[PDB]
Structure formats: structure tokens, C-alpha cells
Write a protein that binds this DNA or RNA. Structure first.
Lengths: 202, 166, 193, 199, 136, 114
RNA sequence: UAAUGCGAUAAUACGCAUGACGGUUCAUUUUUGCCGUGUGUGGUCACGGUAAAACUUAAGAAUCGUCCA
């Protein structure tokens, strides 16, 4: 659960005053203007909660998670406007200090189709013929694109490498496809994992 | 405010508009292996202070080192850092180098008065922008990355930080 | 009118051969099938008694005349290798399409090729770089080393004595190299493999 | 100096990868026929069945039958007239290729639809349908009087007046009138044939 | 603007410029009859039939807020001034522009001179009603 | 070396498609306003006319091209139009369009390119 | 803009045919960064610009593939 506050219509130059106070601007996309009044919603989220979410999940890992947002009045914390079900999309972060600047979220009901870049995870990498011989498992694509339903978003893809030897390559065709999701794109036969001994010839 | 006249707002001949390199925000490309040029440059080409975009991340590895300040590094400094990193990490480590010295610099010998043209090439440099990522590592642990960071910090004039992929 | 104005092969390709290829290699669209586009005949200086890379056009008139007899259409001189050289060429060429293309193929296969000593099969097709239109084309190249097998060079032998050899190229549009081989087989041209 | 090219290999879709996560239910012949008839405008009729999987022989017959009803019941502008012409041209050509797969009812409807529509008749669609139904066994075994009534009315409008075919239809039409089935079409056909006999 | 050949050269050969859009925006941005008068005074020398036609509709829009009171004095002054342009451009209007001129001046309960109405009616009387098809 | 544009009140336009050739005559008052089409004749109209009397092969035929020119000549003559300017574009070089233009000049209509 | 578009005899009388799925190419200024000018102890300031450069989620259009779930 995340807490958000309503905002007034202001210029871009007024955003730094919110960060100084301790809140990060956020935008929620994907509403119908006819029935809701806006196509997008502007709010601000406390930095303390925002940092915890990123640390717990990660900058890219949190994009495959579903969160609950509660909108309340800044002056009176007990006034609740409503609740929303959303998933993070992207994060704007300073390069020199690694501080949050802007959060993009998508309105994600349980019956909507969304495109998610799911991270790839490895299991039983220590117990592998290639590792024992002296090789290592190199990941060429950290994230892979999927089309998932709102009710079923895979937190991550589990690829087992317990039976991989040297020069073994795992392509997109071999990745698991959980229920309620399908692979995106047409560039199949792309290397995702590679058990090798090369270290870049450095 | 934009410094132009009314005829210029309507009939400007600058049809193809390119943002000057000094203030362009596009990230620099990956270094190539082309030979160094023998054409003298201007001093501005070796300096760039605009910060990096607010979406920069690691591209290949799990750990890396970034610069918190702008600077101009010579070819000699890069070679010393490369040897230090290679020795410190391991022989069995994956290293990506994201920088290269390509901008020539000139100098004149002692005992020469001002004038009579520009000097000859002496060495090469590369500009560094704030928040830029310099090196990436893989097939190592986090403690090893910290050791590499501490080893090179005394050898550089700018503050350094650690970046992790998540 | 006691003149040759029809084409046997043309009728065979469209009314007989085309359906058979469709059955062997089903395709979604009717027009998606092997097709023979053009045949090019070339005579260069290296295929003649003259020993020189660049020769004057008046020395190549005889070979141009020979192609006219073989094909029935006038041939053209090759473009000069450079702007500096203007009056010298490097060979002659002629291109045929449609009915004339089919008639030439029929006569070559039925009469001339069987009488050539060292013939086993035509080489395999080669794929060229697609042009701006994005169409992939395959070329089959072979040469005829005995041009004095045609029954037309007998009226004035002394004139046509220097005629030695010729090169032939065929352009085919198809989905794959296997389809090209199927079309060539339908044309009764053995392929060397 | 002549470069050569390598065709990139094809990309076969991986197995167990659904083509779509949307709900697209399967459609049978009965559902397609119901969808085609439940059309109100030429545009809806045009889009009621498209593609070689749904635009089959039975769909082509349904489009022609429904087109006749809409043409008679409504007046159209230039744009809708062009849509109707496109519907007629495509449906007949499909029928000319899958005629041998048609059923008895479909052939009876096709004759009735062709007679009502004012556009030029295709090559020999009516004659071919007559030949298939000329065995004299299908009309006798046609349980549904609707097919017989449509065939009888269609031929009368087209003025075929085949002696053998009509002689068979007469007792069938009279029986249908007695049974109260397809009275309007049967009466219309009988009246037209009786007028022809008088003339 | 496009140079691609097409079925309707009549509506494709029209020349559209940025300067025309600039003036049309100013007319629409005006929030009162007093403001609209100043806009037209500045642009006296750069008014075309399209601008005149749009201005008449602007008077209709502006008077909608004055639901209770009668037509204000500045609105009447604008209507008289615009009529001078209508006479000047009487033979340079399209059927669409004439259509919105009459509606604009009729909404202010103004009466056009009979001679001017006769000239404007030529859009539908001439060419045997061909121009009626152009109208949507 | 593009020439400056010259405004003309009456212009002739052609639209060549896969199936038909369309000719229009449009009157203009200024470049900033839409024109008024005074003639609209295509090979579709000629085909429906000739086919009833004299069989033709298809709309894009020499017989229909001459018929379209004749119908255009009658309309311009009735409306007292004797001189027009041709709008040059890619479609103006079509063989069917060129045949129509040649017929119009012979009939008596003065067509100018510049 | 179905009097459309495309085609491998390519000409246009004949062939494919306007739906449906999939992959490509094109709104509270989306709101953050950044840039310009003025002022300035070198930023607790103001306004504007980005149809010059990084950055969001859609919806539609143009091809292309396809017996169609």
C-alpha cells in the first residue's frame, strides 16, 4: 500500500518544492476521460515509502509488481478520496545522486492486457557441469518481454541450469511460458543464457 | 527568450536543425577501435559539463563505477587505472571499458614566444560528464567491486560512486 | 503464311507445366510460383580468337551478326569500360523475353546441348543481392563451347569460321532454391549435382 | 565484381505460445448463417463473412438471399449501391468455384436470389444449378416445402417453363397449398404457370 | 497542403498559411466585444473572406452570455463595421462562408440590405445549383 | 529552376487511376479559397454511353478517350468557355490523358500549358 | 479514394477483395530533466522554449502474413 496526495495544477518549475518537502511527483496513466474526468492523474508520493519499494523490488524488478495506491488529503490524513490498483512503469532518477524524480504508473485492473519486461532468474547454477569444469553462466538478456493479464503477472522467470555444460545456449524458445501470458515480438532464436569460459578477451 | 528577428521567425535558412554538441543530452556511443586522428582540435571539444540523462543504467554487467563530477582524463591515466583494475579484480573477471581517449592536445616546447601558429599533438584526452558510468564488472561479488572502487579512487581527480543493477 | 510465329514451349509452360508445379509445391497465392524472367546471351573477347581485353567495334561486328542469326534479334555492343575510351568495346550482348525466349530454349535443349561433348548438367543457381524492389532472384549460368552446331552457320562457313563459344544466363524468381531446381527440371535441362 | 546474398532463415512460432490472449470463440456453419442474415446495411452484409474459412459456399448463398431482401425493402445512395455491386460480384464467383459442394436447399435459394437481383447473371450459374437438380429425385425428396417453393417461383420469374420440371412441381405445389405451407410462394408460382399455360 | 493527385482538386489546391491561422486564433481568443474590436482594428489590412465569415459567428458566441440584456452597443458597432467588408467581398465568398455569415448576422437580430442579400443568393442561383453539392 | 506560380481562373485537371480517367474543370477566385467544379466527365460515363450503341472493349480505350474529349467540349461550349490552362503533374503524362488532350485541341478548345 | 489499391505475360475485360487475429513503420502543456534571457556573494529568483536533443501510456492509419481462433 502506498499513500498519495492530491495536487493543484502548477508549472514544471514547482516540482522541486515537492521534493524538498519530501514527496516525489507521480503520474497514473490509463483512464477514460468520459467516465473518470481525466485521462491521467497527477499526485505525489512520500519519498520514504518510494525508496522502500525500490529497495525491496528494484528499479526494473518493481515493474512486474502490482501495488495498491490510497489517495488522501494532505491537510487531513483521515480523508480518503479512493483506492486504485496500479503497476509501476518507469522511474526517473538523477545520474549523479541516484534520487527519485518522477514515477510513472499504469492503471491495471484485473482484466486488462499489459506488456511487462520480466527479469530472468537462475536456479541451481552452482551445481552444473560447466561451472564445475571452470566455466560460468553469462546472461545476455536480463529482461524479456511478455504480454500478461492483470490477474497473472509473473514476478520473474525461473530458468534451471542444473544440466548445462560448456557452450550450452538457452534461447527464447526454451523459456517457460506461464499460464495467462505469451511471448512478445518475433525475434526468437535469440541467446538468453550462455555457459562459456570467455571473459571478453580483456 | 530567443534572439531572432521577425523575418527570421518566418524565412530562416537553417532548415536542418542540430543541437550543438556542447549542450546535447544524448548519451555518448560505445568506444570503437578506429585509429587516432592526426587533425588538431579546439579546446572545447575535450570538455563537456552537462549532466547525463535521468534514465542511465548499467547495460551489460551487474556492478559498475560512475563519476559524480565532470573531468578531463588523459590517456596515461586510463592505462594506469586499467592495470590497477585488472590486477585487483582477477584474471577470471569480465570487464567492460566505456571510455577512450580520442581528442588530441597540442603543446609547444620551452623557449618559444607566443604566435607563429598552433602547436603539434602531444597527447589525447576524453571528456567525462557527471553521473557517467565508466567501468562495468561481471563474474565478481559485491565486496570485490568495492575493493576495485577504493583502489582507483586515489588515482583520479573526481569523486566516484558504485552502481548496481536491480 | 508458312512462317514460324508460334511458340511450343510457351504453351507447355502455362497450360501443362504450371499446374504440376502448383501440386508439387502448394502456395497460398496463384502467382506465388516459379517463373522464368529472361535469358541473356553474352560474347566477350576472352571467348574469341582475338587476344585483347579491349577491341574496336568493327572487329566485333561478326560476333554481333552471329547472335542475330542465333536469336533473331539485333544485339548491342557492351558499354565502354570508361569515358576516356569511346570507340572500343569489350563484347556483345542480347537479351530476350517472352515467346522469343522460349523458342531459343527449345532449340538449344533439343538439338544443340545433346550434341555437346562434355555436358552433364547445368550448375546450381546463385542468389543475387535484392534490388530496391526487394525481390530475390536466382541465376543459372552455363556456356556453349561449340557454336558451329547450329544448322544456320553452314550457308557461309568461311564467314562464320571464327565463331567459337557463347555464355548463357537465366533469371528465375521463386521462393527457394528447391523451387528453382523444380522449374529447371520441368524445362528438361539436367542439373549437375 | 558481383556480390551474392544469403536469405535469412524463417522464424517458426514456438509451440505452446498462444496466438492471442483475447477471447475469440469458435464459429460453426449455423452461427455464420445466423450472423449473415442478421444484417441491416450493405456494409454489415459485406463484413458479415470474410476470409476463405467463413466465405464458403453456404455463406455466398446467404449473402445473395439477404441482399435481395435488403434491395427490395430499402432504397440506397451511390455509396451503398457500390457496396451492393461488390457483394454480388464476389458471391457469384465463389459459387462458380464451389458449386459442386452445395446442398439441395442452397441451390434452390441460389436460383431464387439470382432471379430477384437485377444485376447481370454470371456465366451459367442458373443452368448448372438446374442440371444438378434435374435428376427429379431431389425435388421429390425435398422435405422442406420452402426449397421447392423458392425453386418453383424462381423458374417462373426467369421464364424457364420446363415441361418435365413443372409437371413434377405442380402436384408438390398443390400439396403444399393444401398443407398450408409456403402458400404465398406456391400460389404465386402456380398463378404464374397458369398464366403461361393460358398464354 | 499536399501535391498528391486526388479525386477532389477543388479542396486540395487551397493554399493554407501560418499567418491566416494566427489571425483566426486571435479572433477566437477574444473574450468580449471590446477585445474583438481591437483585434479587428489591428488587422484592418489583413482581413479576408474567411476572417470576415468567422467574425460574424464570434458575435453570436459572445452574445450568448448576455442572456438577459438586449444586444450591447459594441456588438451593434461591430455588426455595422463588418457589413462594409461583406459588400466589398460580396462576389468572393464560398457557399460555406455565406452560410455562416447569414447565421451570424441573424443571431444579432440584424437585417441585411435587400441588395446585398440578392448578391449573396447568387451562390445557389448560379451554376444551376452545382455549388450546393460542395456544401456539407 | 522551378518557375514562379501564375494564378489562373480556369484550370483543367486529370486523375488517372487503374480503371478510369477523370477530367475536371474548376473555377477559382483566389488561391486561398476553394474552387467550383463546372465540368466533371470520366471514362466511366463514356463507357455507359457507347456500350449501348457501339460495343467497346473497356473504359480505358481509344474510343472512350475520344468520347470523353467530345463530351468535355460540349460542356465548355455551352458555358462559353474557350480557353483553359492545364495543370501538369505525374498523371498528366499518362498515355490515356495525352490522347484526350490531343482530341480536345483538334475539336477547337485552346489548352495552354503556360 | 470500390470510377480505390496491388499483380509474377502486367496491358487491365481477368485474378486477389472493405471483417477478424498477430508482427512491423508512423492527455490537467503525458511530466520530469535540460536549454535561453534578465537579475545575482557564484542560485531558498522570475518568465519563456524544446515542431532542436533524453524521457509515459494509449488510440488510430499505412503496408505485410494468415482456411480464422
Amino acid at each position: 500500500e502506498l499513500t498519495a496526495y492530491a495536487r493543484t495544477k502548477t508549472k514544471k518549475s514547482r516540482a522541486k518544492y515537492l521534493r524538498e518537502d519530501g514527496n516525489i511527483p507521480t503520474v497514473i496513466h490509463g483512464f477514460d476521460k468520459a467516465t473518470c474526468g481525466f485521462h491521467n492523474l497527477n499526485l505525489c508520493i512520500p519519498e520514504k515509502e518510494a525508496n522502500a519499494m525500490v529497495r525491496k523490488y528494484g528499479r526494473n524488478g518493481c515493474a512486474a509488481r502490482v501495488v495498491k495506491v490510497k489517495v488522501v488529503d494532505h491537510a487531513n490524513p483521515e480523508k480518503v478520496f479512493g483506492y486504485l490498483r496500479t503497476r509501476p512503469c518507469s522511474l526517473a532518477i538523477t545520474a549523479t545522486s541516484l534520487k527519485l524524480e518522477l514515477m510513472h504508473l499504469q492503471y491495471c485492473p484485473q482484466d486488462r492486457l499489459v506488456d511487462v519486461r520480466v527479469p530472468i532468474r537462475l536456479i541451481n547454477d552452482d551445481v552444473a557441469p560447466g561451472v564445475k569444469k571452470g566455466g560460468w553462466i553469462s546472461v545476455k538478456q536480463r529482461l524479456v518481454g511478455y504480454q500478461c493479464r492483470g490477474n497473472s503477472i509473473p514476478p520473474h522467470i525461473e530458468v534451471d541450469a542444473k544440466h548445462l555444460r560448456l557452450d550450452d545456449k538457452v534461447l527464447k524458445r526454451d523459456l517457460p511460458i506461464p499460464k495467462g501470458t505469451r511471448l512478445l515480438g518475433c525475434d526468437f532464436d535469440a541467446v538468453v543464457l550462455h555457459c562459456t569460459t570467455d571473459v571478453g578477451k580483456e | 527568450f530567443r534572439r531572432r528577428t521577425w523575418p527570421a521567425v518566418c524565412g530562416s535558412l537553417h532548415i536542418w536543425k542540430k543541437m550543438p554538441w556542447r549542450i546535447d543530452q544524448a548519451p555518448p556511443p560505445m568506444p570503437d577501435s578506429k585509429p587516432l586522428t592526426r587533425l588538431r582540435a579546439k579546446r572545447y571539444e575535450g570538455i563537456k559539463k552537462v549532466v547525463m540523462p535521468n534514465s542511465t543504467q548499467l547495460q551489460f554487467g551487474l556492478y559498475g563505477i560512475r563519476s559524480m563530477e565532470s573531468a578531463r582524463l588523459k590517456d596515461n591515466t586510463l592505462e594506469a587505472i586499467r592495470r590497477t583494475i585488472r590486477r585487483k579484480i582477477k584474471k577470471t573477471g569480465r570487464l567492460w571499458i566505456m571510455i577512450r581517449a580520442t581528442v588530441p592536445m597540442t603543446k609547444k616546447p620551452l623557449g618559444i614566444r607566443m604566435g607563429k601558429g598552433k602547436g603539434s599533438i602531444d597527447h589525447y584526452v576524453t571528456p567525462i560528464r557527471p553521473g557517467q558510468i565508466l567501468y562495468e564488472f561481471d563474474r565478481i561479488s559485491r565486496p570485490i567491486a568495492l575493493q576495485a572502487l577504493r583502489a582507483i579512487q586515489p588515482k583520479l581527480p573526481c569523486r566516484l560512486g558504485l552502481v548496481e543493477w536491480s | 503464311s508458312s512462317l514460324h510465329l508460334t511458340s511450343r514451349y510457351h504453351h507447355m509452360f502455362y497450360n501443362v507445366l504450371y499446374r504440376e508445379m502448383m501440386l508439387k509445391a502448394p502456395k497460398t497465392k496463384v502467382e506465388q510460383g516459379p517463373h522464368l524472367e529472361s535469358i541473356t546471351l553474352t560474347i566477350k573477347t576472352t571467348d574469341t580468337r582475338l587476344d585483347k581485353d579491349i577491341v574496336d567495334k568493327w572487329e566485333l561486328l561478326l560476333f554481333s551478326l552471329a547472335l542475330e542469326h542465333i536469336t533473331g534479334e539485333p544485339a548491342a555492343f557492351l558499354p565502354p569500360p570508361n569515358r576516356h575510351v569511346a570507340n572500343k568495346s569489350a563484347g556483345v550482348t542480347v537479351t530476350l523475353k517472352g515467346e522469343k525466349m522460349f523458342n531459343f530454349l527449345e532449340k538449344l535443349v533439343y538439338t544443340i546441348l545433346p550434341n555437346q561433348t562434355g555436358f552433364e548438367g547445368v550448375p546450381q543457381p546463385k542468389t543475387l543481392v535484392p534490388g530496391p524492389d526487394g525481390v530475390v532472384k536466382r541465376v543459372v549460368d552455363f556456356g556453349v563451347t561449340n557454336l558451329l552446331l547450329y544448322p544456320d552457320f553452314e550457308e557461309h562457313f568461311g564467314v562464320f569460321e571464327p565463331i567459337r563459344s557463347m555464355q548463357v544466363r537465366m533469371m528465375i524468381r521463386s521462393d527457394s532454391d528447391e523451387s528453382c531446381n523444380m522449374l529447371v527440371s520441368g524445362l528438361l535441362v539436367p542439373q549437375l549435382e | 565484381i558481383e556480390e551474392y546474398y544469403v536469405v535469412p532463415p524463417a522464424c517458426p512460432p514456438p509451440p505452446h505460445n498462444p496466438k492471442t490472449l483475447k477471447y475469440v470463440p469458435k464459429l460453426n456453419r449455423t452461427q455464420i448463417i445466423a450472423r449473415v442474415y442478421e444484417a441491416k446495411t450493405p456494409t454489415e452484409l459485406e463484413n458479415s463473412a470474410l476470409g476463405k474459412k467463413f466465405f464458403s459456399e453456404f455463406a455466398a448463398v446467404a449473402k445473395l438471399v439477404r441482399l435481395s431482401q435488403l434491395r427490395r425493402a430499402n432504397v440506397y445512395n451511390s455509396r451503398d449501391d457500390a457496396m451492393c455491386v461488390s457483394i454480388y460480384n464476389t458471391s457469384v464467383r465463389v459459387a462458380d468455384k464451389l458449386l459442386h459442394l452445395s446442398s439441395d436447399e442452397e441451390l434452390c435459394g441460389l436460383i431464387w436470389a439470382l432471379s430477384q437481383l437485377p444485376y447481370p447473371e454470371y456465366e451459367n450459374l442458373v443452368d448448372r444449378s438446374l442440371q444438378i437438380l434435374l435428376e427429379e429425385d431431389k425435388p421429390l425428396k425435398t422435405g422442406s416445402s420452402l426449397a421447392v417453393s423458392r425453386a418453383a417461383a424462381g423458374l417462373a420469374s426467369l421464364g424457364r417453363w420446363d415441361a418435365s420440371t413443372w409437371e413434377v412441381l405442380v402436384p408438390l405445389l398443390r400439396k403444399n397449398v393444401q398443407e398450408g405451407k409456403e402458400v404465398e410462394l406456391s400460389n404465386l408460382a402456380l398463378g404464374l404457370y397458369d398464366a403461361r399455360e393460358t398464354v | 497542403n499536399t501535391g498528391v493527385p486526388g479525386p477532389r482538386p477543388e479542396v486540395a489546391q487551397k493554399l493554407s498559411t501560418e499567418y491566416q491561422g494566427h489571425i483566426l486564433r486571435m479572433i477566437s481568443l477574444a473574450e468580449s466585444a471590446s477585445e474583438l474590436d481591437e483585434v479587428l482594428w489591428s488587422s484592418k489590412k489583413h482581413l479576408r473572406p474567411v476572417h470576415i465569415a468567422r467574425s460574424c459567428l464570434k458575435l453570436e458566441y459572445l452574445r450568448t452570455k448576455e442572456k438577459g440584456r438586449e444586444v450591447s452597443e459594441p456588438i451593434k458597432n461591430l455588426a455595422s463595421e463588418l457589413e462594409n467588408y461583406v459588400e466589398l467581398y460580396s462576389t468572393k465568398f464560398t457557399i460555406g462562408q455565406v452560410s455562416q455569415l447569414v447565421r451570424g448576422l441573424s443571431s444579432i437580430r440584424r437585417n441585411i440590405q435587400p441588395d446585398l442579400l440578392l448578391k449573396l443568393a447568387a451562390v445557389v442561383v448560379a451554376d444551376d445549383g452545382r455549388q450546393v453539392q460542395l456544401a456539407n | 529552376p522551378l518557375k514562379p506560380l501564375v494564378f489562373r481562373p480556369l484550370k483543367l485537371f486529370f486523375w488517372a487511376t487503374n480503371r478510369h480517367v477523370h477530367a475536371k474543370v474548376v473555377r477559382f477566385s483566389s488561391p486561398f479559397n476553394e474552387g467550383v467544379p463546372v465540368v466533371d466527365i470520366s471514362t466511366f460515363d463514356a463507357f455507359n454511353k457507347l456500350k449501348g450503341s457501339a460495343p467497346v472493349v473497356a473504359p480505358r480505350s481509344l474510343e472512350c478517350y475520344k468520347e470523353v474529349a467530345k463530351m468535355v467540349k460540349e460542356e465548355t461550349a455551352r458555358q462559353n468557355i474557350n480557353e483553359v490552362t492545364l495543370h501538369l503533374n505525374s498523371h498528366a503524362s499518362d498515355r490515356g490523358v495525352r490522347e484526350v488532350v490531343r482530341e480536345l485541341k483538334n475539336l477547337g478548345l485552346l489548352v495552354k500549358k503556360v
